[PDB]
Amino acid sequence: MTGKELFEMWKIINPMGLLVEELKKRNVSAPESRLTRQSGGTTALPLYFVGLYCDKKLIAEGPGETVLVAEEEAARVALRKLYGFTENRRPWNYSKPK
Amino acid sequence: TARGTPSRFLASVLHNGLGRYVQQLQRLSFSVSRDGASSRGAREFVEREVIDFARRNPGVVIYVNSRPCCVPRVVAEYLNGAVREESIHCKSVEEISTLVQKLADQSGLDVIRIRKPFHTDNPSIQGQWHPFTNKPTTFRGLRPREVQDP
Amino acid sequence: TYSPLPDDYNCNVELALTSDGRTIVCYHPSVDIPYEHTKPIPRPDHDQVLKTRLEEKVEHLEEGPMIEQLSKMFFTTKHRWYPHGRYHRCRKNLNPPKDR
Amino acid sequence: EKDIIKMLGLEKAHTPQVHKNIPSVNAKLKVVKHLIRIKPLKLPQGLPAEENMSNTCLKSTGELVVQWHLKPVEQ
Amino acid sequence: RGRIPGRQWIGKHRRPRFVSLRAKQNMIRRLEIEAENHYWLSMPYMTREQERGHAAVRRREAFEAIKAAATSKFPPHRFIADQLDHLNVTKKWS
Amino acid sequence: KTSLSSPPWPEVVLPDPVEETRHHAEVVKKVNEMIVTGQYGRLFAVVHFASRQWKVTSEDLILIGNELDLACGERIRLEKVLLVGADNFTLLGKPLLGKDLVRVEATVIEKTESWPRIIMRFRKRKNFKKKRIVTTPQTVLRINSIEIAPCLL
Amino acid sequence: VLADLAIYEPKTFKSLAALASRRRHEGFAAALGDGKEPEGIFSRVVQYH
Amino acid sequence: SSFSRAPQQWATFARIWYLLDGKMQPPGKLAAMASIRLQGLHKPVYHALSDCGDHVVIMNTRHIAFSGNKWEQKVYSSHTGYPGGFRQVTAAQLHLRDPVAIVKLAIYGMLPKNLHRRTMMERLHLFPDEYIPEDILKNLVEELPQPRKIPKRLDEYTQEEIDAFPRLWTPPEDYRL
RNA sequence: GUAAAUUUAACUGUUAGUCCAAAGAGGAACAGCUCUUUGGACACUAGGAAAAAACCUUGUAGAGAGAGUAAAAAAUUUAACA
Numbered sequence: 005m006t007g008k009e010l011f012e013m014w015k016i017i018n019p020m021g022l023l024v025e026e027l028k029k030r031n032v033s034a035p036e037s038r039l040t041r042q043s044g045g046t047t048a049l050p051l052y053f054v055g056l057y058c059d060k061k062l063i064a065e066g067p068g069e070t071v072l073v074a075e076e077e078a079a080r081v082a083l084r085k086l087y088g089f090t091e092n093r094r095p096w097n098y099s100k101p102k
Numbered sequence: 103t104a105r106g107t108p109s110r111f112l113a114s115v116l117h118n119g120l121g122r123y124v125q126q127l128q129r130l131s132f133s134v135s136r137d138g139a140s141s142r143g144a145r146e147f148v149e150r151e152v153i154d155f156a157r158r159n160p161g162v163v164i165y166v167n168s169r170p171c172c173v174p175r176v177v178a179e180y181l182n183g184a185v186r187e188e189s190i191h192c193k194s195v196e197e198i199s200t201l202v203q204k205l206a207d208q209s210g211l212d213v214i215r216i217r218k219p220f221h222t223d224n225p226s227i228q229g230q231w232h233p234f235t236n237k238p239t240t241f242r243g244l245r246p247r248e249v250q251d252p
Numbered sequence: 253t254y255s256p257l258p259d260d261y262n263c264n265v266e267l268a269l270t271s272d273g274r275t276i277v278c279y280h281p282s283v284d285i286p287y288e289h290t291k292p293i294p295r296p297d298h299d300q301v302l303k304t305r306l307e308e309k310v311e312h313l314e315e316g317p318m319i320e321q322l323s324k325m326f327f328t329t330k331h332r333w334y335p336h337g338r339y340h341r342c343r344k345n346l347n348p349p350k351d352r
Numbered sequence: 353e354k355d356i357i358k359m360l361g362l363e364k365a366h367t368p369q370v371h372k373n374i375p376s377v378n379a380k381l382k383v384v385k386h387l388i389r390i391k392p393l394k395l396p397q398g399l400p401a402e403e404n405m406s407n408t409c410l411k412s413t414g415e416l417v418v419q420w421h422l423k424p425v426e427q
Numbered sequence: 428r429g430r431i432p433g434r435q436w437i438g439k440h441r442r443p444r445f446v447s448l449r450a451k452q453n454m455i456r457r458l459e460i461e462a463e464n465h466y467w468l469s470m471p472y473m474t475r476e477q478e479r480g481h482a483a484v485r486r487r488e489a490f491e492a493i494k495a496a497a498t499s500k501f502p503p504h505r506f507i508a509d510q511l512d513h514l515n516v517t518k519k520w521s
Numbered sequence: 522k523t524s525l526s527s528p529p530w531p532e533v534v535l536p537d538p539v540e541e542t543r544h545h546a547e548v549v550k551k552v553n554e555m556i557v558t559g560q561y562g563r564l565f566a567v568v569h570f571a572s573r574q575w576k577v578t579s580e581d582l583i584l585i586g587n588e589l590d591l592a593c594g595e596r597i598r599l600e601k602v603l604l605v606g607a608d609n610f611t612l613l614g615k616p617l618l619g620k621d622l623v624r625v626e627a628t629v630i631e632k633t634e635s636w637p638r639i640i641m642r643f644r645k646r647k648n649f650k651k652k653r654i655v656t657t658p659q660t661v662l663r664i665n666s667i668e669i670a671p672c673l674l
Numbered sequence: 675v676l677a678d679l680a681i682y683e684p685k686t687f688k689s690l691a692a693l694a695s696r697r698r699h700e701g702f703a704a705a706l707g708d709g710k711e712p713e714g715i716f717s718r719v720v721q722y723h
Numbered sequence: 724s725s726f727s728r729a730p731q732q733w734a735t736f737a738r739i740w741y742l743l744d745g746k747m748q749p750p751g752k753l754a755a756m757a758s759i760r761l762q763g764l765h766k767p768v769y770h771a772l773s774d775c776g777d778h779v780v781i782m783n784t785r786h787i788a789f790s791g792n793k794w795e796q797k798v799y800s801s802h803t804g805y806p807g808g809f810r811q812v813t814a815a816q817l818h819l820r821d822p823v824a825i826v827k828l829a830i831y832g833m834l835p836k837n838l839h840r841r842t843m844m845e846r847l848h849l850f851p852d853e854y855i856p857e858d859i860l861k862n863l864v865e866e867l868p869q870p871r872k873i874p875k876r877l878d879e880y881t882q883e884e885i886d887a888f889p890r891l892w893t894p895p896e897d898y899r900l
Numbered sequence: 901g902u903a904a905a906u907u908u909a910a911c912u913g914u915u916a917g918u919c920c921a922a923a924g925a926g927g928a929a930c931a932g933c934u935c936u937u938u939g940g941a942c943a944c945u946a947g948g949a950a951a952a953a954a955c956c957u958u959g960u961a962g963a964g965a966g967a968g969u970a971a972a973a974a975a976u977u978u979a980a981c982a
């Protein structure tokens with residue numbers, strides 16, 4: 005699991021649906037998707053950054069070529085932060101046990 | 103040249119050295135000649151050096167076969183499946199010992215050009231740069247020359 | 253009220269020195285995009301008798317007009333969309349090395 | 353000028369060389385004074401002794417320090 | 428339309444060359460270095476009379492080493508073992 | 522007030538050193554408390570090894586261009602660390618961080634040699650042509666872990 | 675390393691940019707000052723012996 | 724950033740549309756700003772073979788300003804190939820004939836002299852006036868600051884600024900002026 | 901201050917020369933001209949003066965995805981008058 009991502013190993017369908025259920029277990033309001041960044045909307049190579057906001061507080065943000073794809077990516081980023089599988093998380097401790 | 107030869111990125115076998123180090127050398131097959139003049143150094147290596155070398159490398163199986171041959175050779179086989187055959191023709195005992203020790207220290211990957219003298223599966227910790235990394239946001243996300251509530 | 257750089261686009265940079273002065277400590281927490289600086293996503297996009305069938309509107313175009321369409325679509329020149337001979341196709345490495 | 357540079361042991365550029373401040377040595381320096389940088393040697397702690405021969409360093413200021421600990425000063 | 432007759436940097440008619448701002452600074456920088464060299468050559472530690480003979484002993488001994496090395500040239504020794512070890516090329520296992 | 526009456530750049534007033542010294546202590550203590558409570562994830566470091574500065578993190582690989590006189594599998598500590606950083610804080614040396622502050626350890630996993638390198642010389646119309654092939658020894662190091670201790674005072 | 679830090683550690687690079695900007699401003703104050711003030715906090719040099 | 728591999732690469736190498744206002748601005752300073760963005764030289768991830776260029780939109784190219792007498796001195800010359808087809812026109816004549824030619828030629832000369840330059844020009848959009856197509860407007864991202872500060876005319880100064888500047892001399896009371 | 905020098909033994913090749921700086925001669929105080937002298941460079945490396953044998957910087961050889969430097973960018977805009 006050195007370079008592998010969480011969802012590259014755990015394949016899921018509709019991450020947004022799973023994200024909503026996780027927040028309900030944590031008594032957190034439903035996230036709201038908004039466009040934080042946008043570039044080349046009318047062109048063939050767009051860029052969108054969709055941010056998920058709970059109680060008007062940013063929890064995750066994700067890029068994508070379309071709003072639907074970027075929103076799905078943001079849900080994956082939110083799940084990674086909630087589950088602790090961030091890219092910059094603490095590396096596995098392979099040292100000898102004390 | 104680099105264009106006329108293959109290339110690869112720096113890597114290891116099964117992330118060797120991360121949890122534990124496993125010697126990638128797996129097998130050494132020597133072919134020495136009893137009477138061959140070019141195998142004089144090979145015979146010297148077998149008499150006094152291969153026995154001590156086997157003690158220091160319990161994980162490497164060494165096969166010494168004494169058969170008539172004009173060019174003695176040593177075949178090194180690694181865990182990843184790579185097979186490397188090296189000639190010890192008219193080599194002294196010291197040169198053979200250096201060559202054998204060189205084979206033990208190698209990972210078995212192809213000895214070709216390596217594009218980068220470093221490898222990392224997590225090159226970024228704070229987040230890879232994108233064009234909006236250092237761009238401030240505007241109120242209501244209005245684009246330049248955009249009118250709100252027309 | 254002095255700040256070496258604005259703290260409104262990337263992170264809040266705070267510079268400090270230890271007591272001995274041998275170490276520079278930088279505290280740069282990330283900045284979150286405010287809710288007020290975001291646009292809502294564009295969620296919104298007859299008694300017909302016959303079932304609505306999918307209609308193929310992709311009409312074939314000649315080599316000339318197609319490349320003009322491709323060049324304008326991606327803002328490139330026409331030269332990229334012309335083919336190349338077998339000599340260059342066979343030289344391409346179909347299994348290039350991959351890093352991470 | 354090429355020969356005098358060899359006599360003074362200045363074959364390699366940017367390599368400091370120590371010479372005595374005597375008229376005969378200065379006579380050679382005057383010939384190639386346009387090819388060299390001349391600085392006086394400073395001894396803040398005096399000449400190196402047998403005990404600290406191996407702990408000497410020539411700083412960019414022309415000072416030869418007899419102690420070189422590679423540590424920051426505590427002051 | 429503007430061409431230099433013959434070669435550019437040689438001849439009666441040459442392409443003009445002009446001194447840039449950094450070209451002057453580089454020359455002045457080297458002039459300052461040589462000016463300081465003039466100062467440090469103005470204060471000899473000893474006079475010529477005092478200097479005389481103060482290193483004659485070392486210079487003579489240095490040349491005697493050169494003479495000794497020059498006159499020490501001779502063919503190297505030859506050993507029986509070196510000649511006999513050539514028989515090992517036909518050494519074989521029993 | 523004219524166009525050249527004042528310099529184009531705006532005036533800059535540096536903070537009071539007496540007040541800023543207190544501010545620096547607060548920042549150092551804040552970052553030091555993060556290390557005590559372990560409020561950091563993956564750490565990246567810039568180490569000076571074999572005349573070159575390598576930006577490394579845990580589980581990385583570096584290809585040194587010379588033999589290190591070390592058996593394969595031996596673990597060594599890189600004592601020259603110019604920078605250690607996290608997701609929120611970064612420590613800078615002047616020019617090197619203290620040994621007690623940061624500890625970087627690496628493992629020797631491969632001792633090999635480079636691919637053959639062609640060294641060719643050629644001068645036209647002079648019958649000048651020589652060829653040499655060189656294989657430089659190499660050592661592969663795997664960065665195992667990067668550890669920081671609360672030594673910021 | 676700075677090129678790598680610019681691409682993969684933008685937050686660290688901004689701190690380096692801010693540090694250079696702060697040191698640059700301290701140099702300007704020193705030039706304008708007559709020398710009757712202490713050195714800048716980031717302008718101090720660690721001496722080695 | 725904990726992004727997936729495909730979106731992470733897409734975000735880094737995305738194209739950004741920049742808007743530059745050329746009113747009362749020298750074309751060369753506009754060209755220098757545009758040239759950097761077109762080549763991708765403003766990105767830390769820049770490389771010649773990475774094709775990291777961006778789109779530059781310049782408006783009010785008809786209202787550019789030339790320092791000195793460059794309107795009457797600067798000459799744009801080209802040859803049609805046929806004998807006697809050497810045409811030389813001043814900057815003033817070229818500007819009136821084509822309002823976007825002066826800025827276009829300045830940007831074209833600053834780009835690298837290779838086969839990527841013509842592609843980079845396809846990302847450059849020039850408009851003589853404030854009119855910009857709706858599609859071009861909808862994809863704009865950031866407006867670059869004007870390289871030159873436009874000086875204010877005498878009548879643009881407020882009374883407070885006029886009162887602030889002191890009178891320097893006392894004219895004679897009997898002078899006709 | 902330096903490490904070369906002479907002698908003895910055995911030979912080959914070079915003996916059709918270019919520019920620059922300097923003192924001169926011939927020509928016309930012409931030549932990328934011709935002839936001597938002092939020195940440099942070229943006929944060997946690399947950087948620079950745009951391209952560049954002769955100007956400038958720099959030489960002793962390998963590997964590096966380190967670093968400090970050397971030479972190194974052209975300046976200038978003018979006619980009133982008792």
Ligand SMILES: [K+]
Nearest residue numbers: 433434438440
């Ligand atoms: K000429």
Ligand SMILES: [Mg+2]
Nearest residue numbers: 432433434435
């Ligand atoms: Mg010519």
Ligand SMILES: [Mg+2]
Nearest residue numbers: 840841842844
């Ligand atoms: Mg074209």
Ligand SMILES: [Mg+2]
Nearest residue numbers: 910911912913
């Ligand atoms: Mg002869």
Ligand SMILES: [Mg+2]
Nearest residue numbers: 918932933934
């Ligand atoms: Mg001649």
Ligand SMILES: [Mg+2]
Nearest residue numbers: 938939940941
């Ligand atoms: Mg000569």
Ligand SMILES: [Mg+2]
Nearest residue numbers: 914916917943
């Ligand atoms: Mg010849």
Ligand SMILES: [Mg+2]
Nearest residue numbers: 947948951952
């Ligand atoms: Mg050249």
Ligand SMILES: [Mg+2]
Nearest residue numbers: 364959960961
């Ligand atoms: Mg050298």
